Design an enzyme around this catalytic site. Structure first.
Site, PDB file in Angstrom:
ATOM      1  N   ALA A  63       0.853  -1.082  -0.097  1.00  0.00           N
ATOM      2  CA  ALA A  63       0.025   0.097   0.160  1.00  0.00           C
ATOM      3  C   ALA A  63       0.833   1.140  -0.057  1.00  0.00           C
ATOM      4  O   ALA A  63       2.155   1.093   0.188  1.00  0.00           O
ATOM      5  CB  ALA A  63      -1.146  -0.030   1.127  1.00  0.00           C
ATOM      6  N   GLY A 106      -0.164  -5.112   0.994  1.00  0.00           N
ATOM      7  CA  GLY A 106      -1.620  -4.773  -0.168  1.00  0.00           C
ATOM      8  C   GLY A 106      -1.507  -5.720  -0.965  1.00  0.00           C
ATOM      9  O   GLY A 106      -2.645  -6.359  -1.638  1.00  0.00           O
ATOM     10  N   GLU A 109      -2.185  -9.442  -0.538  1.00  0.00           N
ATOM     11  CA  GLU A 109      -3.503  -9.692   0.028  1.00  0.00           C
ATOM     12  C   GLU A 109      -4.432  -9.379  -1.212  1.00  0.00           C
ATOM     13  O   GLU A 109      -5.284 -10.097  -1.579  1.00  0.00           O
ATOM     14  CB  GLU A 109      -3.703  -8.554   0.881  1.00  0.00           C
ATOM     15  CG  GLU A 109      -2.969  -8.868   2.318  1.00  0.00           C
ATOM     16  CD  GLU A 109      -3.152  -7.890   3.239  1.00  0.00           C
ATOM     17  OE1 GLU A 109      -2.667  -6.603   3.022  1.00  0.00           O
ATOM     18  OE2 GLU A 109      -3.753  -7.844   4.205  1.00  0.00           O
ATOM     19  N   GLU A 129       4.125  -6.082   6.597  1.00  0.00           N
ATOM     20  CA  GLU A 129       3.349  -4.980   7.349  1.00  0.00           C
ATOM     21  C   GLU A 129       3.881  -4.672   8.737  1.00  0.00           C
ATOM     22  O   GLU A 129       3.799  -3.568   9.283  1.00  0.00           O
ATOM     23  CB  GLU A 129       1.793  -5.235   7.449  1.00  0.00           C
ATOM     24  CG  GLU A 129       1.167  -4.872   6.126  1.00  0.00           C
ATOM     25  CD  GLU A 129       1.000  -6.165   5.073  1.00  0.00           C
ATOM     26  OE1 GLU A 129       1.856  -7.107   5.578  1.00  0.00           O
ATOM     27  OE2 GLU A 129      -0.102  -6.114   4.338  1.00  0.00           O
TER      28      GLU A 129
END
Lengths: 252, 253, 244
Positions: A63, A106, A109, A129
């Protein structure tokens, strides 16, 4: 769209992440555009399958941190940060993640949200993360664990180490590994096969499979059987089965 | 006596062999009913402690009889509850071993997954071609397959109809072991023998505990297992098993 | 004073070594109590961010010890309630209770000599420390049934491709590698690591939809902590995070 590229070849929609200067880092705009496009692709009767891919360098590095950097709990709870990604999971037609190079945070994911996951032999997965003082926010702790086991998921999520395409494949994360140069070719050949199936049959199949994560086996079995009974109310079942009996090809 | 299968006792091991070579042991209503009857009989038989199910060296079972399904209506299906009788196999308390050689596709792949232990031959090819026919898996494929090998691969298999070889099935969780084709049948007996010589009640409880892992939260599964473990001391077989081990010999439960 | 284990502290890493090679680290009531007592203190110690459990190079723990009311074995559940991350470094024999204890841990690092199994059934008993649950969820039904019903062992390489273990390393390096993994983990934000671990555990306790919701709420909570703020600042400013 500012951050993605969408094209249609026959019955296959292809969403390509397009932020080359940021290794396709996910952000609020990508989240909105990818979901909007897939949603739109989902509602199009001429589309039977959807591919999501990035560049040969990066599926998606993670992200965008600047966006998240100055959020308080308040800001987060209020926007329900990341919630909108859920829209992708609600897509009824099959989605295929074609993953080259980095799929981290992200990114990893995102790829796990798709139904089918084809990886280039250069693919690299991870959930770094925790290094930022947080944890996966896009389903990583849930979908990773369910794919590869607690031991490996705990390892990836607590250390931030990456997993190569070969390990992902033998672990349960990806459907297939191919040479980086054939990725888009295989992915599209795969989407082609799927979009060529009955549209109702594929949507039922996919829903059935998703059930395996939402209840007990006894309930999932019952669900599947009732969905199976339903298929016999569709023209596609009748034709699909007649064609096999008539040693010919199925025309839906 | 049966028409589509062959049942055979080998001491404490029951062996159900799908006998429909012309159709590649393709499953159908009569196989469904005969296999579940045979397995139920074996299960109730005190002299039998493990059950094997297998087809030919060429095909475990290559799909189902499509003719029986072609003309079905939803009302036919719902009223008949088409396929529900297969649940009888999963209700069997005695351990069951699927010895899979060659083709295990559609209902055949699902029939193998219904068993507790899966020994596959060199030659085994697994798959769910149902999508090709305009339906989907109806004997638990979408459920058992996904739980063994994970979403990515199950989605792949169920949406494309692609087959998966013995080696991939072992690496991904579909099968217990892969042995050479000439040995499968022999290997399956040995495994079954091993199991049938355990305490019958302990073995039934072990299998029950493992099945719990798919029906509830871990915390509940743990509580169940623990209460089941306690009950295992309320048996004499525990005494024999201890004494045999201490005396460094074989138990006689 | 522990009679069956050794407990060491290296920076933010706690290390519990099972120490009864007279029985190949077999687990009796006393081992259970001492490990759990040790893990629980290390958990409450703020200077510890990771905890390792290991046996000898010959046996992590060769098995349980043969010889309703008492809720027997229920004190083991206390290892699962440890909030700090836990790593099992498994060398050689991890059988029965040994295998189960290794599965109770978050991260599992195996030596190439590691041998796993659940031989309970051969004594006419059953796994009683969670093995029918955790094993099955790790490696799937066909292999869980095989192991549990026949008692056969599983070598490091099979455990690795099946999902039982995180990674396999050479026996000479096992302790170093595990310490290094623990070090990395204990250098993360403690709150973040505890949250991460609790998130991953949710995946076995409810539906996917509820897990996703739970994770997302924890994630949001993380933004109330100093560490998310520091961890993220340190990334943008391309430097090392200083977690407090």
């Amino acid at each position: 769209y500012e951050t993605i590229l969408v094209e249609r070849d026959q019955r296959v929609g292809i969403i390509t992440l397009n932020r080359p200067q940021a290794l396709n880092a996910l952000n609020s705009q990508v989240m909105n555009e990818v979901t909007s496009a897939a949603t739109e692709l989902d509602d199009d009767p001429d589309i039977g399958a959807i591919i999501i891919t990035g560049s040969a360098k990066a599926f998606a590095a993670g992200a965008d941190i600047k966006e998240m950097a100055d959020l308080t709990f308040a800001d987060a709870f209020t926007a329900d940060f990341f919630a909108t990604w859920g829209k992708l999971a609600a897509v009824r037609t099959p989605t295929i993640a074609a993953v080259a190079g980095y799929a981290l945070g992200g990114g990893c994911e995102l790829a796990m949200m798709c139904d089918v996951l084809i990886a280039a032999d250069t693919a690299k997965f991870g959930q770094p993360e925790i290094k930022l003082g947080v944890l996966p926010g896009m389903g990583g702790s849930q979908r990773l664990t369910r794919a590869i086991g607690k031991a490996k998921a705990m390892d990836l999520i607590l250390t931030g180490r990456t997993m190569d395409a070969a390990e992902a494949e033998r672990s349960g994360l990806v459907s297939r590994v191919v040479p980086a140069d054939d990725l888009l070719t295989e992915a599209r050949a795969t989407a082609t096969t799927i979009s060529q199936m009955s549209a109702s049959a594929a949507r039922m199949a996919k829903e059935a499979v998703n059930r395996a994560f939402e209840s007990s086996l006894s309930e999932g079995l019952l669900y599947e059987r009732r969905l199976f009974h339903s298929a016999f109310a569709t023209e596609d079942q009748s034709e699909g089965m007649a064609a096999f009996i008539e040693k010919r090809a199925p025309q839906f």
